[PDB]
């Protein structure tokens, strides 16, 4: 006799997926979202006359959960200009920007990545069972920098791969866990060309928010925004959920999908297991941010890495023409290197990378400062992947999901969807 | 005012998927299946104390649609013994059986396959859009043998790759379309090690029939077996469906999922488009069959190719031990090379490959003789992939699906599931 069969906390991809799974079974379903918008660590917006994605953006058909959703809802891919590049740049830690022949640039990051992931087949034959091999557990004592130091890379190759890895860490690479990277590489078919294609090439037709809305419309669930959950109590065979204004909603089961780094906002009664408490105290690593810049010049199709002591770590073209100029998509590994909301600073750093351009505008999102993400994409520190099952475990009538808790594409939209399908299955089990 | 909102014809993976999609929307749904069982070109059975799969068997997490279903229903993988092989054999067209070091055997098929598919990245950058490039249309004038003749392969390599390709054709390789193979290779991450892992390594926990049953239970649809549809007439804004005993069922929309090679059993009014009629007159190529053999000896973990003039084209171990002996899974490219239901012949051919073994039993399935498949897995002849859209097109209130009609993994369970998700979306569009 509860208010709802299931309450889903969080309206990103994990929560939207879980609510869709539950609603299609006929369960009375409520989704509670803290922000005044949906999408979570994805956010569709507009800038310089284009639709832009200020969080998670790119997907691929090798990513099984999100691709199946795109198949169900009839969403095509939209290709960003990553082939036939006009310029490929590396900006080293010492501030030098060097233009590299695009063919040579791609050959060298491929060599570095395949060397970094040389044992991916042996360590992760089953990337959706991350601790399947003893070697993966042994490697979880090492960081990505530990391995980079043994590869004998050239100066170009070392700068490229350390830029790539600092971005995926949202942190310096001495803190970044090694097995999680090998596992993503295995997910992308154990080969660099395939894996790179999955990461920044194709966007969703209609945007991330379009797929969120399709799922929630399908679900039939009641959806409420601007309602943060601040406490969850298991009592009377179900759960009592309290919001910041002390209203109480009861439910048979709760699906938690909030980002790991935000669990400090929520009091659990009884306390969560010690393993989960350890993960909550640690958090995940990433301190990233994202921004678009509109410049007056037509730079064509460009790509740049910047190493971890520099701010503009991953740059590529979103749009270009003589009439428009260029819109650049820029992802930042560590928000401490640049205040993406400080336009003067942004203009200085962009000109450092592209001397002589005039900045006509910017659009930025500081995911690390946002109270309802407190960080960016999921990134495991040393030793954390080994303990993933602690985060995944159900605790009585509370089910846990979110990209951090997925087995496969944990840094991606796909991993969020995966965790939501798992959550739907677990809700069905708990309501049987 | 029809009997049903939607009638799904056929209870293989495409039909089970479509019925699930439609039932979860609340549409009044009926599935009609011709055989007295479900599963279509998959069939879970029992032999020598083990559960066996006499049709489609192996899946992979790089296959997005079937993997997402396994995530939803909580189905793990079951690994067959393909690593650390004890014996790898090649049987040439001239009947010689040669034992090859397993490491060398794998190196040589990898070289042959990567050479055959050397241009897969350029021809199929988007494997789910098969005619995206002009080069793919140009290559659809050539057969797989046409390309093999230009590779300069060794005797071992040519025999290995021609065996592999005759199996995927279910026919001799001079008739097999080239682009469809390049496209499957692209689906498997554009690399041989990944692609091979997707094809014969992992089975579905609980079997193909377990996943069919889960989908149809979820669907809530009414399911009727031993009811072949023999005619479909579009009339009165919907469809009239006639069965072999002249009963008539009416519906708003019909989803056709029967195998292409069986369309001769069904009269359409009005006639289907000329493009579809051409495909129906041509059919798809494969003439394959499958069988398991129980021998008294423990052969360990074995793998064999046999070239296309010989019958046992793809052999691997299903189970082995000293107490049990060995169960071998054998797939046959062309049913004209061996009568899989003739036990004496099977014993002769197995002994030709494994001289000295004692055959204790067999279990076989002649998919090419079965009236409700009239062939095996989908295999395109020369020029057919270019015309795929003709087969996919809706015709008024009739939607078409089945693995032959998919864009990606068309030779697989995954492509069937893909086509069923597409059909569900199209039914939703037609009922709006
Ligand atoms: C800048 C940037 C860039 C990328 C990416 C992320 C970021 C930040 N990613 C990763 C991808 O965006 C990410 O993995 C998923 O969006 C995570 O979805 P979840 O639903 O797990 O969490 P997510 O954080 O999206 O959703 C959780 C929800 O919980 C809410 N919430 C928090 N506390 C709450 C409370 N107390 N009460 C109620 N609700 C609460 C939040 O407001 C949020 O809506 C990505 N991926 C990819 O596939 N391709 C890409 O290109 C990128 N790039
Ligand atoms: C021997 C063998 C081996 C393999 C495979 C196939 C075969 C035959 N495949 C391919 C895979 O099995 C195949 O692609 C799908 O099962 C096809 O699913 P569909 O639903 O498209 O057709 P499918 O043929 O399964 O379903 C069509 C249904 O329509 C019914 N029907 C026909 N005419 C009718 C009528 N007039 N009225 C009513 N119903 C009618 C049939 O009885 C059948 O149940 C495979 N794939 C893979 O992923 N891994 C693998 O290892 C293999 N290996
Ligand atoms: C594809 N991604 C997953 C998480 C980070 C992200 C990414 C990669 C390159 C540039 N920006 C974001
Ligand atoms: C994995 N497959 C798809 C269709 C044919 C099939 C196959 C491959 C190897 C041996 N038997 C069947």
Numbering used by the authors:
A (entry chain B), B (entry chain A): 51 to 482
Text from the published report:
Nicotine oxidoreductase (NicA2) is a flavin-dependent enzyme that catalyzes the degradation of nicotine into the non-psychoactive metabolite N-methylmyosmine (NMM). NicA2 acts by degrading nicotine in the bloodstream before it reaches the brain. Clinical use of NicA2 is limited by its poor catalytic activity in the absence of its natural electron acceptor CycN. The higher in vivo activity of NicA2 is due to the presence of a cytochrome c, termed CycN, that acts as an alternative electron acceptor to O29.
We were unable to solve structures of NicA2 v320 but were fortunate to obtain well-diffracting crystals of NicA2 v321 in both the ligand-free and NMM-bound forms. By contrast, the NMM-bound structures of v321 and wild-type NicA2 are very similar with an overall root mean squared deviation of <0.5 Å and no obvious difference that would explain our observed change in activity with O2. Our stopped-flow experiments demonstrated that NicA2 v321 has an increased rate of oxidation compared to the wild-type enzyme, but only when it is bound by the reaction product NMM. The observed increase in the oxidation rate of NMM-bound NicA2 v321 raises an intriguing possibility that the mutations in this variant alter the transport pathway of O2. After addition of NMM to NicA2 v321, we observed a substantial downfield chemical shift in the major peak of the enzyme, possibly due to conformational rearrangement in the tunnel region. We confirmed that these conformational changes are relevant to catalysis by observing a similar spectrum after the addition of nicotine to the enzyme to achieve the NMM-bound, reduced enzyme state that was rapidly oxidized by O2 in our kinetic experiments. Therefore, observations made using the NMM-bound oxidized enzyme report on the conformation of the enzyme relevant for the oxidation step. After NMM binding, NicA2 v321 undergoes major rearrangements in the tunnel region, as indicated by the collapse and substantial downfield shift of fluorine resonances in our 19F experiments. We further demonstrate that this new conformational state is overall more solvent accessible in NicA2 v321 than in wild-type NicA2. This may indicate that the mutations encoded in NicA2 v321 allow greater diffusion of O2 to flavin in this catalytically competent state.
